[PDB]
C-alpha cells in the first residue's frame, strides 16, 4: 500500500473511533490503524527521499511510528476490556499529542488534503482571467480619445492593481504548492507579500476615491461642476499610491511579512503585532467600507426619489457593484483579523484552518472579477471586448 | 421580393438582434423585419397555392403575419427607449410565433421516412444502456478502493460525461421526433445543445488525460512515482472541465446553437461560423487524436520490445512485476526486469535472474488496463471521425462543398456519435476482468 494512501487510512479510522458507540467498533478501527502504521513505516517519505535509510532525518520518521504503534496497542488493551470512552480518550489525546512529539506524524494532520488542489485551482483560474480580463480593460480605455475622459484613469489604476499581483506573487505561490514550502529566497518572500499589500490596500483607496467623486457629482453637482478635475484626477491617483506605500512600511519594523504554511503563501501575519493588524482592519477596511456605504446610500435614495432609464444608472452602477463585490470578498478575512486583534491568547486558536483558507481563497479570487462585472453590466464594455477579440481573429 | 427569399431575410435580422451591442443595431434590424413581413403577407404560399385568397386556409397565413408585425412594433417601442436586452428578449417571443405559426405554410420538408424510427431506436437503446452501464462504472470505482487508485479516477469523470446527456438532451430529442419539430422553448434549445457540447468535448479531454497518464506510468515509470498524485488528478479533472466550458462559450457570441430539422436535435451548426467550426474540428479533435495516437505508439513499441513484461520464476513460481519491482532488495517500483543487474536473485528461493521466463500473453487489465483504454480511444475516434470530416469540408468552402453533403450521410454521422455515449462500460466489461468482477458484485448485491 502507498504512503499517501496509508496516511488517509489512519486518519479515517481515527474519525470512526470518535463517532463510535461500542468497544467492538473501536477495536476494529484500532486494528486497521496499527496495520496501516507498520506499512507506512516501511515506506520512504517524499522530502527525505534522497536521504539514507539510516540517516538522522529518515530514521526520525521510522521511530515516530514506533511510538504510535505502542500507543495503539495501549488503546486496544482498554477497548478489549469493554471500556469505550477510556479508549476513545487514549486515541485523540495520545495519537495526535505524540504526533507533535514525533514531528513527521503531525504534518499530515495539520493541513487537510483539499487545500493544495483547491488553492492551485483558484489561483490558476484567477491568474488566467486576471491577465486577459484586465488587459482588455486597459486596451478598451486606451483607444482614440477615450482617455480624455478623466474617470477612465481609475479603471487603469485598478486594472494595474489587479494585474501586478498575477505577474509576481500568484505564480510563486503555485510553485510553493507543487514544492510544498516556499521555493524562493527570503528576498522574494517579503517582496511578494508587499506587492499583494499594495494591490489589496491600493484597491480600496481607489474604490473609495471613486465613491466620493461619484457622490459629489450626483448629490452636489452644483458645487462639483464649480471644481475642476481634468488634472485633479491624475494627482489624486498618484497620491493614493504613495499614501498606500506609506501605510505598508510598518511591516518592515514589526516583522509581519513571512510565509504562512497554511495558505502556501508569504503574506501578512495577524499575530506578529495585534496593534498594527487592528489598525489595518479599521483604517484600511471598516473605515473606507463605511464612508462608501454612506456615499452610495445617498445616491440610491435620490434614484428611489427620482422614480429609471438604463443610461441614467450608467454613471455609477458599474462602480457600485465592484465595491459590493470587493466588500464580500474581503469581509471574512478582516473579521478573522479583528478577532485575533482583540484577544489572540484565547480567540486565535479558535479559528479553524478550513475557515482561514476559505477567507484567503475568496480574497485571491477578487483579482479577476472586475472585468466580468464590466462585461455583464456595461453594454459599451461588452462591445469593446468584442472589438478587440475580433481584431485578433481578423 | 420572393416569399422564400423574404423568409430568409426575417431570420437573418433575427440572428443580428442577438449578436447586437446597441439599441440602434436592434431598431435597424426590427425595421427590416417588419418590411419583409408585409411583403411576404402579399405573397401566396406553395402548399395552399390552389386554395382561395379568402379560404380559411389561405386567410390563416395572412392573419399570422398581422400578429408578428404587432409584436415587432412592440419590440421597437423598447429599442427606441434605449433598452437593448429588454427588446432582445421580446425578439425571442417573435422567434417562437414565427416558428409555431409561420412554420405551417412553406418550407421544404424533404426527410427520408427512416430518419424518424432509426434515430428514435438508437437514442432509446443508447439512453438505456448509458444510464445502467455507466451507473455501474461509477459504483464499482468508488466501491473498490484499490481499482480507484489505479489511475481510474478519470473513468468516473468520463462516465459522468456520458451520463449527463442521457438525462437532458436525449429525452428531449425523442419528444422532438414524436412531435415533428422542437416541442420546447428556445431556452431548452441552446441549453440542450450546450450539455451535448460538454459531453462530446469533455470526453476527448478526459480520454487524452488518461492517454498521457498511462503514457507516463508505463514509459516514464521512475520519474512518475517520484511525482505525487493524490491531489494532482482531482486538480487535473477540475481543469479539463473548466477548459471545456471555456472552449464552448464562443457559441453564444457567434450564434451556433440552434435546432437542426434533419436530425430533430438542437445542436451546433457548422455553417453559422466556419472560423469557429474549423477550430472545433482541429483543436478539439485532430489535435487530441494526434497526441494520443502518439501516446499509444510509444506504449506499443515497449510491448513489441517486451520492455515492460512480467517474469515468472521457472523454479519457485514467483512472478516479477515491473509495476511492483523488488523494493526490499533494491529494485524500486517501475523497474523493468531487463534493467535489474545480474547479481539480483529471486526473493523467494534465491535462483538467479538467469532462470526467469517472461509471461507471453499480456492481459488487457495489465499496465493500468492500457489495452482496454486504447480500445475506447479507437472506438471514440471511429464514432466521431465522420462528422468531424463533414465539419472540415464545410469549414474550407461552404459555398460549393456544403450542398454536396447528402442528408443520408449527415444523419448517419450523428447516429454513431450519439451511440458512443453508451459503449465504454461494455468495453470495460468485455476486456477488464476486475470490472467484470465488480459488475457481478453490484448485480448480485441488489438481486440478493
Ligand atoms: C498591512 O500590510 C499588509 C501587507 C500585505 C498584505 N497582503 C494582504 C492580502 C493579500 C491577498 C489577499 C488577502 C490579503 C493584506 C491584507 C490582509 N488583511 C488582513 C485583515 O489580514 C496585507 C496587508
Ligand atoms: C463546439 O460547440 C458545440 C456545442 C454543442 C455540440 N454538440 C455536439 C455533438 C453532440 C452529440 C453528437 C455529435 C455532436 C458538438 C460537436 C460538433 N462537432 C462538429 C464537428 O460539428 C457540439 C459542439
Ligand atoms: Zn524462484
UniProtKB/Swiss-Prot annotation, chain A:
The keyword Disulfide bond applies. Residues 140-152, 213-231, 298-319 are cytoplasmic. Keywords: Cell membrane, Disulfide bond, G-protein coupled receptor, Glycoprotein, Membrane, Receptor, Transducer, Transmembrane, Transmembrane helix. It is found in: Cell membrane. Disulfide bonds join 189-266. It is a multi-pass membrane protein. Expressed in retina and less in brain and hippocampus. Melatonin binds at residues 251, 270. Residues 174-191, 253-276, 341-353 are extracellular. The chain crosses the membrane at residues 119-139, 153-173, 192-212, 232-252, 277-297, 320-340, 354-374. It comes from the Eukaryota. GO terms for cellular component: plasma membrane; synapse. GO terms for biological process: camera-type eye development; chemical synaptic transmission; G protein-coupled receptor signaling pathway; G protein-coupled receptor signaling pathway, coupled to cyclic nucleotide second messenger; glucose homeostasis; negative regulation of cGMP-mediated signaling; negative regulation of cytosolic calcium ion concentration; negative regulation of insulin secretion. High affinity receptor for melatonin. Likely to mediate the reproductive and circadian actions of melatonin. The activity of this receptor is mediated by pertussis toxin sensitive G proteins that inhibit adenylate cyclase activity. This is Melatonin receptor type 1B. It comes from Homo sapiens. The lineage of its organism: Eukaryota, Metazoa, Chordata, Craniata, Vertebrata. The gene is MTNR1B.
